[PDB]
């Protein structure tokens with residue numbers, strides 16, 4: 001099943017941020033609140049905002065930050081790329097051990113979707129090769145964050161800013177830099193051609209086998225390069241030797257050599273699933289990493 | 298449409314571990330009571346077929362190790378209610394949310410916080426199947442993990458995890474210790490009924506497709522509830538109840554499509570197939586999104 005990290009450590013950091021008639025979510029760590037900078041915009045501003053110009057015209061008191069019932073007083077503000085940093089007079093006692101990371105395409109993370117500073121739901125996402133994410137975000141979800149948890153440490157990797165015409169989503173790392181060629185302006189933006197995350201499809205095929213589902217296997221094999229030629233033809237990402245190494249544990253667990261599973265995937269790509277299903281899906285799933293599969297099986 | 302779990306923090310604040318001897322599982326700490334599966338009192342060998350009453354008679358408060366993290370919670374009373382143990386502890390959980398215990402119906406969905414040794418590992422959304430199993434992800438040590446819904450501020454606990462069936466699916470109790478389905482907490486082979494498709498949820502999914510502009514399958518006809526139920530059963534679909542018709546009300550009102558007209562549309566899909574088409578980007582009809590899940594995600 002698609003499993004997210006427990007969201008409690010992040011819930012304790014969500015607040016509401018309002019400027020004018022614009023409300024969204026912020027992330028309160030220690031005495032700083034992080035949020036998308038387009039909170040400072042009006043309707044007119046959003047088409048071609050000059051953010052540095054808009055921000056110098058703002059005072060601390062134009063920012064209304066609420067942690068539940070309690071307003072937090074803003075005593076400082078700065079902008080780092082597409083993120084606004086609001087210094088507040090009080091520290092969050094619920095601040096977890098945390099870091100800010102920038103994730104790579106193909107990696108997965110959990111999203112805590114929030115509205116008006118209140119958590120609504122949690123789900124698992126992957127950073128697509130074209131640097132979009134297939135999220136579930138509505139009006140008011142900006143400032144929702146994505147994260148992974150290791151031991152007691154929350155690694156924040158994503159802050160939500162926008163939806164594209166196709167319905168997929170785009171956002172930034174916590175330094176305010178977009179993933180992908182996108183801009184925080186109210187304009188229709190296309191992404192580059194997406195590709196399928198091959199190492200993740202293979203991991204999920206291994207998961208299907210670990211759960212006793214093996215109709216798709218075969219006795220053929222393939223070289224790494226010959227598989228990569230077919231993959232690219234079908235708009236699948238190439239598989240590196242590191243990807244092969246990272247699948248080792250799953251190969252050992254099942255006794256199916258990585259390149260043998262590549263041969264299975266090749267046959268699926270060339271012939272399709274013939275109305276069949278794998279782990280209940282009519283489509284090859286590519287948003288489980290090898291680590292996700294291992295951690296859960 | 299994503300499988301979206303509830304935020305898990307209010308439940309994370311209630312997870313503890315319970316150990317008897319070397320048997321450890323998870324428990325749920327609310328106020329000054331810890332709830333857990335009663336088979337914590339079994340040796341691995343007693344699980345073959347345990348006599349729980351006799352096993353518990355030999356137990357005292359001081360045989361139970363309850364820990365929140367590595368901090369011990371002293372047990373001051375114990376009792377067994379059906380298949381759950383209730384351990385009274387000397388500290389009221391400061392993180393107790395507003396809560397209730399509810400018994401869910403097959404087809405309803407809930408979030409599971411999968412825990413090991415009292416530590417949450419992940420959260421995911423589950424549906425109770427019509428045969429009273431869930432298709433969970435649960436490893437050794439996961440028993441006592443709970444399933445829940447959140448309404449406003451209030452956590453409704455509906456599931457506590459006890460066992461895995463030969464087919465890989467999972468079975469458990471409500472928080473009063475009453476199993477869902479015909480299962481018992483004994484380490485013996487037990488078969489679920491053949492499963493069926495959750496009709497009310499497929500209908501919810503068809504309403505969601507309409508809301509998003511995908512409506513090629515809407516037909517000109519209607520049906521009675523009884524005629525629909527008799528046909529649906531021939532395709533291994535669950536019959537609808539009056540409660541199902543009522544919980545489809547909001548989506549019916551939002552789209553202007555009567556419930557029985559949507560049933561007629563589904564009947565046609567069942568009798569004629571998708572004729573090569575797709576709905577919401579899928580050749581398969583999805584049955585693990587409830588009417589509430591649709592509303593919760595679309596609006």
Ligand SMILES: *[C@@H](O)[C@H](C[C@@H]1CCNC1=O)NC(=O)[C@H](CC(C)C)NC(=O)O[C@@H](Cc1ccccc1)C1CCC(F)(F)CC1
Pocket residue numbers: 322336339344435436437438439440441459460461462463467481482483484485486487
């Ligand atoms: C929690 O204590 C644990 C969770 C199980 C273990 C793995 N996945 C799960 O969901 N529950 C049990 O171990 C449970 C205890 C009984 C007293 C109810 N027994 C159980 O789940 O048995 C199944 C899995 C298992 C196999 C081998 C060792 C331990 C557990 C068996 C599978 C085959 C069967 F169905 F025929 C009999 C039970």
Ligand SMILES: *[C@H](O)[C@H](C[C@@H]1CCNC1=O)NC(=O)[C@H](CC(C)C)NC(=O)O[C@@H](Cc1ccccc1)C1CCC(F)(F)CC1
Pocket residue numbers: 024038041046137138139140141142143161162163164165169183184185186187188189
């Ligand atoms: C922040 O909460 C919000 C989240 C969006 C809202 C819907 N789903 C989301 O994920 N982001 C924005 O409002 C963002 C603001 C810019 C200044 C960066 N704009 C945005 O996402 O625009 C898309 C969605 C939208 C539609 C209608 C009204 C408001 C927002 C548009 C999609 C259609 C388009 F491509 F033509 C233009 C952008």
